[PDB]
Amino acid sequence: TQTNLDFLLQTDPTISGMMQKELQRQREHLELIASENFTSPAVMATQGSVLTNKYAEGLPKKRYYGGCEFIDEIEQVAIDRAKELFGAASANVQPHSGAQANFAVFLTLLKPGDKIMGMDLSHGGHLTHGSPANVSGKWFEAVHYGVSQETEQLDYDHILEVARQERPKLIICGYSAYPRIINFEKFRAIADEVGAYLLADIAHIAGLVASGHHPNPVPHCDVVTTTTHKTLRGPRGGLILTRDPELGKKFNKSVFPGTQGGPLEHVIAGKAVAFGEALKPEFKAYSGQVIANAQAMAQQLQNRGFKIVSGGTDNHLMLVDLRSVNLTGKQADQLVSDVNITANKNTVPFDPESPFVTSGLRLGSPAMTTRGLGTEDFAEIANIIADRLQNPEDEQVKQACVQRVAALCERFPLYPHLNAPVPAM
Template sequence: MNEWHTRPLRVVDPEIAEAILRETERQARGLELIASENFVSEAVLEAMGSVFTNKYAEGYPGKRYYGGCEFVDVVESLAIQRAKQLFGAEHVNVQPYSGSQANMAVYIAVLQPGDTILGMNLSHGGHLTHGHPLNFSGKYFRVIPYGVNRETEQLDYEELERLAHEHRPKMIVCGASAYPRVIDFERIAAIAREVGAVVMADIAHIAGFVATGLHPSPVPHCDFVTTTTHKTLRGPRAGLIMCKEKYAREIDRAVFPCVQGGPHVHIIAAKAVCFKEAMQPEFRAYQEQVIKNARVLAEELARAGYRIVSGGTDTHLVLVDVFSRGLTGKQAESALERAGITVNKNTIPFDTQPPMV
């Protein structure tokens, strides 16, 4: 092995090594409260940094376009088996690079350009990939947004049902990126059946709670379930698709060769590790504590005079209306950062301010 192959990062690239060191220190000394971030274990980090990063492996276990994939097949098969066990899914694809690409693959599997979808309004807590005009989902499909009730700031299921019957969508997308309450996936799936639509549930933020039974699972009710593997799952930054067995072929073909090329095997290895960690008793205890902490934080902020969007939280998310106290989200984010607390500004329902303010 040549010398260049074994030199440490601090020798090869001291600038990058310094940036990594500084970021490690920043994460260690501060309080990280961004809901879409989490801390992975040393085991997950080790898998991500393994020699599997060297391996190309287009295809699926037992059906690869490259040789030398026998151990790749072991890793991907373990990840699939563990994800199925963790969530109770009929079929799983562990190859998506991200949650956005997982969602894209589902759309491609069952929709045609111009088809109608119902998705949660981004400003009410939805995600860009649920139909925002600047996203591929809003560019290629006819999107009917639904949202929350103005009074309760909780999902307006009556409005969703009315819109579904009025527009007869091909798909209803549920799940959110900034909604702190329990989502009634069973009710949404029932509405979809009434109008002949399929349902995709995006559980990127709540996957850890779903996996541990602390949030009702969409898996028995929805045709497709997507998630990221970071956030509450504490895994690598990547995506996952679960679906009913009847859609397995379409989903796998949509992921590869349609949306992606070769899978990131080192990341799939890390996913397998995180799924195993999520099946341990201490993982449920951790998830329970996360919810308790979020509820106490919301209660104390309310006691201090801050308005909590929707009146509280059922998850890890706490949405605080700082504008009612004369602050913008950007100002609050900057002030907290100076105090060593990292949060993110976010729109809230019926917000009149630009998203970057």
């Protein structure tokens, strides 16, 4: 009996072949981009389902259209599992992305021209928290706080002073390159002092929140946004949570009809699955291992003479300052790409280089942790990177790095049931 994949090979061999090549690419490199992960077979199965065919504008049991009996059930399972996982009174699982989740919150709380305050984009703030190239900075007045030049982490007394001076309507916490625990109770105290709304955008750390390895913002903030991918290891999509169920209804209307049309019900089924996985003990152990792995990589890089911004990490990621090897982030990113390692350049706090150049490399553990790597495997990764960056013109080092990458990939197969290679025998 024919599968959907059989149909794809028969009718579009070009796309079929390129998809096979992308699986092989995933298998044969070290994925160290801190926002990346490998979602489950079960999640992928939902995304490949007939749920793509249902229009389901509205909410479970309050749809514009009939025929949503089963979409409602699936969406309500997603909602209910999200509420369970994050201890939340309200969840909206329809946002197409983290950007769209944030946008729906802005549409609810703000009007164009209102002032928002988030982390400086060069200190780990997100594009959607006030970049001039994003709607958040183009149609709102974005101001910023950064980290302490001394500690390279947040100084809550300084944030309070900035907030008192700027008087934002919305304060945003949660970041894309911040390696330490965020104190949501201190953010609440600050927001209350200046009469601001408080959003925690926990996209990067949501799996750590879900597993109890990071404090949960939900009881403290007005609203919490996240992606369903990243550390939560779900399908690509967004999520809005809030402790306030009446406010939750307002966010609902801002998602639809405020921001979006019909939701992606196949992706929402994937969200339900991913939340279901995160409710299990295996995921809690996984999240523990993510942190341990990131800490092991950071420590070995320190042992190899690199500076880690803030001196280490409490989460899944780290920023490597590249002064010790006299390289820009851009150069370092290219050099590790050339040995089959994916990372990305990142400004360090108080970087003297442009954002186009940077002095940092951002690394994270989630993706390779999903493939089963342990702390000593991550110390090996640290050594491969240090070798490459310390000897960038040495071709024999380059090939040793290539070989050591290949050995790690061979030891930790990815999705081995899919397009399995021809047996050696």
